[PDB]
Subunit: 122 residues, 4 copies
């Protein structure tokens, strides 16, 4: 309300420059991300995510499940292993929808990475 | 805030038919649609394990037990008969529900035999 | 209601196998579709549409505005002219969202084409 | 039923910066965001007239009057400085409203000069 309000698609959070740690094309299962990283970016298990590959430029859509907390895992499995490889630097983002007013004051959850998937607030 | 969540996935089915010239839609055995919660005419993503292509389309139901995965029309440029593919659909819901949501996943081997019981 | 209902993305309608009639990369303006065809497929002016190119396999997302009724126009303009050319056979679809119950009994608006963009119900 | 509608578009801007290695986001002059109704952190599509590539990302605001169109991070693989691109965002609303919706379109020439009055 107002009913019929125009709804925006906004960046909810992203993991900026994580490094892919595992990639298995033949995997019977999902992509996975350390739960600590999900938490920092506000990303949920089984939430749609975009992955934008800094190393090779590929851009694709998938979902991930939680890897154990503290594992530092970024696993890109199944068909998505044709789009990322271990060592590649990627950006992982999720988007949510909300009405325009809320969108204009929204602050995304952004976590920045370096080194061995070490996470910084800024 | 509204989240986009995996609703369900058919993991590792084989394309059985692919007709570029079809006057009609892609089709999936209704038993596989049933297992993954995927509806006739719902938006689906198809991720091709054999060639890496990733595309979006929709499917209607094929006859139960036919094991059909048919990728027709323009989509026949992105998969061929015998390719292994992963098919998923996504739904939206508020954050509060999405935190406990569980998707429907079905796994397959061989000639489209669903790992079942 | 129930509040929080799971919302599906469903095919609202499509134009099956129309032929692209104009394509201008340098165009200051939009893609356009004869209003009669929009009407048959339930597609709106300025609605997001997917175009799946049967001739060259490209798949892309755009929007169109109404061309004059009866012109039989399918015009693919701007950057999208790198994805379709005059003569190419394409499928144009739109998707809408709705709750799961409604989705299970939804019937999309499908119009089939042949010849000089002559439209049939079946 | 909920429709996805064009909210607004920047038609024919030139990319002014493209840094693959950026610790940060794509950026657009706030005056251009203002003209097309596009928000900081909103999902946008970028359609590259010069090379045909089409991708999705988001942007934050660049300084007013800077004329900046900066395509950074992985997206720097899809556009270069001097490419002409079209940037759009989409919103959703019920069918009843979408029937009369009007998007915000701004047209440009030259060095990112918005056709204005």
């Amino acid at each position: 309300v107002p009913r019929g309000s125009m709804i925006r698609t906004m960046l909810q959070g992203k993991l900026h420059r994580v490094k892919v740690t595992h990639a298995d094309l033949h995997y019977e299962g999902s992509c996975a991300i350390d739960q600590d990283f999900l938490d920092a970016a506000g990303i949920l298990e089984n939430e749609a995510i975009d992955i934008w590959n800094v190393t090779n430029g590929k851009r694709f859509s998938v979902y991930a499940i939680a890897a154990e907390r503290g594992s530092r895992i970024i696993s890109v499995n199944g068909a998505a292993a044709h789009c990322a490889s271990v060592g590649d630097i990627v950006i992982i983002a999720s988007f949510v929808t909300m009405p325009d007013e809320e969108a204009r004051t929204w602050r995304p959850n952004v976590a920045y990475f370096e080194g061995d998937n070490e996470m910084k607030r800024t």
